[PDB]
Design an enzyme around this catalytic site. Structure first.
Site, mmCIF file in Angstrom:
data_model
loop_
_atom_site.group_PDB
_atom_site.id
_atom_site.type_symbol
_atom_site.label_atom_id
_atom_site.label_comp_id
_atom_site.label_asym_id
_atom_site.label_seq_id
_atom_site.Cartn_x
_atom_site.Cartn_y
_atom_site.Cartn_z
ATOM 1 N N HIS A 74 25.534 -34.509 13.017
ATOM 2 C CA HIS A 74 24.360 -34.845 13.815
ATOM 3 C C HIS A 74 24.684 -35.621 15.090
ATOM 4 O O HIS A 74 23.789 -35.876 15.906
ATOM 5 C CB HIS A 74 23.259 -35.520 12.980
ATOM 6 N N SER A 130 26.709 -43.758 12.043
ATOM 7 C CA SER A 130 26.956 -42.385 11.634
ATOM 8 C C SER A 130 28.280 -41.904 12.125
ATOM 9 O O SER A 130 28.684 -42.177 13.248
ATOM 10 C CB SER A 130 25.851 -41.478 12.137
ATOM 11 N N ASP A 149 26.884 -32.633 6.790
ATOM 12 C CA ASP A 149 26.820 -33.441 8.012
ATOM 13 C C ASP A 149 28.222 -33.932 8.365
ATOM 14 O O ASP A 149 28.544 -35.108 8.212
ATOM 15 C CB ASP A 149 25.861 -34.600 7.805
#
EC number: 3.4.21.39
Lengths: 62, 221
Positions: B45, B177, B89
């Site tokens: 992402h 992230s 992801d």
């Protein structure tokens, strides 16, 4: 072809997602991969995922 | 990183700060980690139009002689990544030039039971309503049984780890992230997502599942 508008309010549940109000406009950064699109809010400047069924293209719906 | 502490500068030399140029407007940021001289692992992402990686950083606003700032030439986003579920992801970034292995810049080694203590580092927010941190932060988090992530509708224990005791506020958060979860000094997870309100646990990509995919990319590139 990338300018879209929220049709409903939405409260994000995942930190990757945007919260928004009905009428908020977005530039779509990527139309997927999947049913959530990466977008930038033109109200807040924040980027995140939005559910594609909550938005419509601004230019064609007037 | 919520509930952690500032790292000793340059003590986590695999950490990568990613600046991602988007289709419209200002850049976004993520973490990542160096796994080969010219490959960085991160979350899917975090993809965008172009990415610059800064290695060797502590305070991301203070250039130092340790910095190695490298452009990404290819994004290898997992082909089954899906934005509805956030499954898969994971993304590999090929760098335009190889990093120099120095005391301040190195690769993270690869090799996990619930209950064990792990560590995660990043430049993300230090609270729900706090800005990202200029300095690299790290926190120790408990690896949870997958049942602790039952409230995440799309959680898949084969693909993902459930990380962070829900009775504490300690957690990875926005901006973290892509960063690695280390357990006993080796990469086990990648920060993926969690609750908008930052209440743990959060969801991490389980690296072990992706070793074959990673290896094929590395062997071909």
């Amino acid at each position: 072809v990338t300018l879209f508008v929220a049709l409903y309010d939405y409260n994000a549940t995942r930190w990757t997602d945007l919260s928004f109000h009905k009428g908020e406009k977005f530039q779509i950064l990527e139309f997927g991969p999947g049913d959530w699109w990466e977008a930038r809010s033109l109200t807040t400047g924040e980027t995140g995922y939005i559910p594609s069924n909550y938005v419509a293209p601004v230019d064609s719906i007037q | 990183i919520i509930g952690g502490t500032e790292c000793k500068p340059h003590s986590r030399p695999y950490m990568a700060y990613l600046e991602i140029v988007t289709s419209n407007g200002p850049s976004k940021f993520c973490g990542g980690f160096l796994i080969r001289r010219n490959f960085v692992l991160t979350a899917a992402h975090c993809a965008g139009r172009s990415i610059t990686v800064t290695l060797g950083a502590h305070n991301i606003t203070e250039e130092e002689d340790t910095w190695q700032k490298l452009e990404v030439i290819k994004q290898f986003r997992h082909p089954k990544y899906n934005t509805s579920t956030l499954h898969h992801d994971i993304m590999l970034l090929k760098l335009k030039e190889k990093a120099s292995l120095t005391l301040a810049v190195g690769t993270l080694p690869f090799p996990v039971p619930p209950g064990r203590m792990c560590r995660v580092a990043g430049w993300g927010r230090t609270g729900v309503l706090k800005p990202g941190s200029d300095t690299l932060q790290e926190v120790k988090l408990r690896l949870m049984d997958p049942q602790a992530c039952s409230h995440f509708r799309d959680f898949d224990h084969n693909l993902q780890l459930c990380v962070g005791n829900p009775r504490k506020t300690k957690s990875a958060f926005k901006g973290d992230s892509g960063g690695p979860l280390l357990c006993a000094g080796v990469a086990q997870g990648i920060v993926s997502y969690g609750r908008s309100d930052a209440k743990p646990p959060a969801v991490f990509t389980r690296i072990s599942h992706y070793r074959p995919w990673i290896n094929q990319i590395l062997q071909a590139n």
